[PDB]
Design a protein around this nucleic acid. Structure first.
Ligand SMILES: Nc1ccn([C@@H]2O[C@H](COP(=O)(O)OP(=O)(O)OP(=O)(O)O)[C@@H](O)[C@H]2O)c(=O)n1
Ligand SMILES: [Mg+2]
Length: 443
RNA sequence: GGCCGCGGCAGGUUCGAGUCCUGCCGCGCGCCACC
């Protein structure tokens, strides 16, 4: 359990076994065979072309390079055409930039169309930097392949690996740049402890400077932030893990933690012990890609959360879950019920023109003067969070994200109490409420 | 699809809105994700 003895035992978890590598090289050989037959200019990129892919996560990436003059429509129609021809089975489902996900001799393959650029300053597509990323990294990452796999596995085990909107973590390319900048996994962790939200890491200049936000400068484009989609919280979660690790190293930092089935009875006791209002908004999952869904679930959850605050239900945290059929927006509040009456502010006693208008309004109770101005007692239209959210989600369905809001419009329901604990949201509830010992890394 | 702006324009809430909530439109190949 020394710092180095543990990184030894952890390499056995992140390094692919020779039975998987052979399966990868065999698929790579067949892929080049079919691609060469089509006479298309292509290039292998990603973690596979650099031998930095994690164990159990084998995926080959192939970029097809087309002329600059091609329309975005022509790029797609030709890209998808080649892709379908090369892959055994394929699947076309993307958010913006077209590509083909499929299989070749049993391995995951992605055939991505892009432009054959010279100097990637003003890229035309989003993915035109990727060949240039591979060209810059192949010569510098050599020898340090396992130092990347330690960093990737370290993050994946703590659920902050990936730049996708489902994660908002560290892209696999960001990890490689960090190893080139620090040399080893150990040196990244040591230095990561003193990162801040202002840290700028310019790999191209071998410099660490201060800036406006966390910014890892892309060697290929000094305007591009490689860590653009790394949330501030996940940045923090990483720094916290590094300080914890150096303070007390362990192999568990690399073991993926999975949730535990919590009894619906134990959960009912925890919520009762807290005395908070725990409820959820349930609606049909819109049939869209995760990268469109999660930003909207984030938005919807925020809009309802913000509503609860200004309505004085004093919310604690928010959360959401996406099952196969349904989406859930979870909330916890300190106020299960508020009075119907509240005090609305009136004008100062001086200018009677405003006061006369203020006092003319028919109210159930008599207004009063306090500290030099008038006040009135008015009634609320709802006195609980559930009743409030019911109203908001019904009327303001449109502002909860395009697809989510349109799904909430057609139907939604607020689930509370025990009826909630039978839903697929136990894990999300325990994370939200800070329940202890609801996770484990037992194999 | 989400996010950030320069503007706006109207509407709702209010004694009172350039200031809180909402809807619509323009412009930065604006930024990010799908690789
Ligand atoms: N947010 C992202 C994600 C990736 N890439 C580019 O996409 C390539 C590979 O895509 P991806 O599969 O997403 O990352 P991998 O390096 O393959 O990581 P992993 O295999 O673990 O998924 C990288 O070379 C990188 O230049 C990028 O610039 N921006
Ligand atoms: Mg890959």
């Amino acid at each position: 359990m020394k710092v180095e003895e543990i990184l030894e035992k952890a390499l056995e978890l992140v390094i692919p076994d020779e039975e998987e590598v052979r399966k990868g090289r065999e698929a790579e050989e067949e892929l080049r065979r079919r691609l060469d037959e089509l006479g298309v200019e292509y290039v292998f990129v990603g973690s596979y072309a650099r031998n930095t892919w994690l164990k159990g996560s084998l995926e080959i990436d192939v970029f097809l390079l087309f002329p600059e003059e091609f329309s975005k429509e022509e790029l797609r129609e030709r890209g998808l055409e080649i892709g379908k021809a090369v892959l055994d089975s394929y699947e076309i489902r993307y958010a913006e930039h077209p590509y083909v996900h499929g299989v070749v001799k049993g391995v995951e393959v992605d055939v991505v169309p892009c432009y054959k650029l010279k100097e990637p300053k003003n890229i035309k597509s989003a993915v035109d930097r990727t060949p240039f990323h591979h060209k810059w990294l192949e010569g510098r990452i050599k020898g340090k392949e396992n130092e990347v796999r330690l960093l990737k596995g370290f993050l994946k085990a703590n659920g902050i690996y990936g730049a996708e909107y489902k994660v908002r973590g560290f892209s696999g390319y960001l990890c490689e740049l960090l190893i080139v900048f620090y040399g080893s996994f150990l040196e990244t962790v040591k230095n990561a402890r003193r990162w801040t939200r202002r840290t700028v890491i310019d790999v191209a200049k071998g410099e660490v400077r201060k800036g406006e936000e966390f910014f890892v400068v892309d060697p290929v484009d000094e305007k591009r932030n490689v860590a653009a989609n790394l949330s501030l919280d996940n940045l923090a979660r990483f720094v916290h893990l590094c300080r914890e690790f150096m303070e007390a190293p362990s192999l568990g930092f690399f073991k993926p933690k999975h949730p535990l089935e919590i009894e619906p009875e134990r959960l009912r006791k925890i919520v009762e012990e807290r005395g908070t209002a725990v409820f959820a908004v349930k609606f049909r999952k819109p049939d869209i890609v995760d990268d469109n869904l999660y930003p909207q679930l984030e938005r919807a959850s925020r809009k309802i959360f913000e509503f609860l605050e200004r309505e004085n239900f004093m919310p604690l945290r928010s959360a959401f879950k996406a099952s196969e059929e349904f989406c859930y927006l979870l909330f916890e509040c300190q106020i299960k019920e508020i009075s119907r009456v509240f005090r609305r502010m009136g004008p100062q006693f001086e200018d009677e023109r405003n006061v006369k208008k203020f006092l003319s309004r028919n109210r159930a109770f008599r207004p009063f003067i306090e500290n030099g101005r008038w006040w009135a007692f008015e009634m609320r239209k709802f006195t609980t969070p559930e009743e409030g959210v019911r109203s908001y989600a019904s009327t303001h369905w449109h502002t909860l994200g395009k697809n989510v809001g349109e799904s909430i419009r057609e139907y939604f329901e607020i689930i509370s109490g025990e009826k909630l604990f039978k839903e697929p949201v136990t894990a999300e509830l325990c994370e939200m409420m800070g329940v202890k010992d609801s996770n484990s890394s037992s194999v």
